[model samples]
Target: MLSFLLTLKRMLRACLRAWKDKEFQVLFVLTILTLISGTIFYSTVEGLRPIDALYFSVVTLTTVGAGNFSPQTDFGKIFTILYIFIGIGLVFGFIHKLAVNVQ
Candidate 1:
């Protein structure tokens, strides 16, 4: 705690100082979309069962956090990589459609 406390305080001061709770909810929203949304996609479209699907979903959402875990086909890998960009678009791009984007 002591080490990160010092580092954390510095880091949090640097980054979290610019934080907004409204935008903070965007992070939460991203989680739901990445986890639940990707879970459903992987389960049905990717054809992994829920356990493996959820596993891949988190791994994908988090980035190349794998040694022996991943999709098993060329098409699947291509699609998975493609979803990363698509998911990012939905994150920053479509977040423009959140409640704040009212007319």
Candidate 2:
């Protein structure tokens, strides 16, 4: 298990180094934009304070999905579904890209 974990970490570092190239920056920027859009959506649809909405967005991105807060309206729920996909997709894409570039 320890060896597996070490390999995983090394693989992750390699991925980041690969993404160090400019080609991956676009994906990274798009991901941040998507997250910003999600935060704006949360603020408007959920009537949440901006800080709370941003906090919610960050936690959701991390998949912490704390559940202490969530969308209440139908639109909010729909938006949240979209948000989750985008967030998870970016994360996995980052990890996958990293793993493939590892030596």
Candidate 3:
């Protein structure tokens, strides 16, 4: 229980630190926009609920690849292909930048 609190505190500090950095700020915005765009696309094209679409976008972007949710239409499939490449790059790029900044 104590370890969990320590871990949470560390995560909060790291997040606060990232929130202060200008580059991180830009990356954060980019990441959010990418997720939002993907969420919108998945919701519209795949006919998923807003929560499900957002979850799919985050899972895909983070490379979770749970396989529980999938795109049905050709547009959803094609868009997912593009979204994966682009989204992972942006997400990892932000994470990489944040990690580097911490060190």
Candidate 4:
């Protein structure tokens, strides 16, 4: 219990510090933009629901694709290929900032 509380406290402090950093701020925005872009593409091109589209966006970006969902259209497949490249880079940036700021 104590260990969990301490871990949570550290996470909160790190989040606060990251929020104050300009680089982290930009990274966060880019991360959000990436997710939003992916979500929009999946929702429109693949005709997925908003929630399912967002879920697919996160799954693809994190490279944890569960295989149950995928792009059926040619355009969706192409966009997904590009999205993966950009999303992975953005997510990497986000994670780098978090790792550094979170100690």
Candidate 5:
């Protein structure tokens, strides 16, 4: 268990360092903020329980757009559109940037 924790810490450190590049810095920041905002939005607006909120956040952020839960208000839908635009754009851009960097 201790070893697993240490390994997780090391992985987090590596991710933090790798995000030093301009593209990656944007990726890291946006990803973190998405998580924070999504947590709040999911619970309050989407009427999701905590665990469901987290699940919805990840699925939405990843662009899976599963139909389990959806925004019921105009404001919520508007937020969804904006969230998709920003989240998917940044995430896909980050993936492309990483591919370029790795090769």
Candidate 6:
């Protein structure tokens, strides 16, 4: 419980640094746009609610799925496979930058 605040603090500091760093700022925007694309694709094509789609989109990009919601269509499966494959790099790139800044 107490450790959570530290995480909150560490995350905030990371954000603070990223805001000023050009490369990390680009990484942040690219990652956010990737998430937006995923959310929209799942909501429109996969028939998921926006909130649920966003949740799954974020989870999949982080490679940490809940495993309850999965794509039903072959198209959906294909999109998700590529989404994870492509999106994980951008997400983790930003995450790695954040971790480095937090230190």
The lDDT leader among the candidates is: 3
lDDT of 3 by residue, 1-103 (tens): 9999999999999779778989878878988998999889988998989888999999998888747888889999999999899876886888788678766
lDDT of 2 at 40: 89
Compute the lDDT of residue 100 as modeled in candidate 5.
87
- Per-residue lDDT of 20-83 in model 2, one digit per residue for the tens? 7774786688777876877788889899888888888888877887568878899988888878
lDDT string for model 6 (1-103, tens) is 8799999999899668668998787887887898999889999998999999999999998889857988989999999999887776886777787677666
Stretches > 4 Å off in candidate 2: 1-19
How much lDDT does candidate 2 score? Answer: 0.81
Model 3 whole-model lDDT (C-alpha atoms): 0.86
Better of 1 and 2 by lDDT: 2
For all candidates in order, the CA lDDT equals 0.69, 0.81, 0.86, 0.85, 0.81, 0.86
Stretches off by above 4 angstroms in model 4 are: 1-11, 95-103
What are the RMSD figures for all models against the true structure?
6.9, 4.8, 3.1, 2.6, 5.2, 4.4
Q: Model 3 TM-score?
A: 0.76
TM-scores of the candidates in the order shown: 0.53, 0.73, 0.76, 0.79, 0.67, 0.74
In model 1, the runs with Cα more than 4 Å from the true position are 1-20, 73-75, 86-103
How much does candidate 6 score in TM-score? 0.74
Two-way lDDT contest, 1 vs 5, winner: 5
Q: What is the TM-score ranking, best to worst?
A: 4, 3, 6, 2, 5, 1
Least accurate 10 contiguous residues by lDDT in model 6: 94-103
Position 51, candidate 4: lDDT = 89
* Stretches of candidate 3 exceeding 4 Å from the true structure: 1-15, 95-103
Flag clash pairs in model 4.
none
- For model 1, how does the per-residue alpha-carbon lDDT over 1-103 read when each residue is reduced to its tens digit? 8997999899787555435455655776777767886778778776878887777777666665656667777767887888677657656644564554444
Model 4: which ten-residue window has the lowest total lDDT?
94-103
- Model 1: which ten-residue window has the lowest total lDDT? 93-102
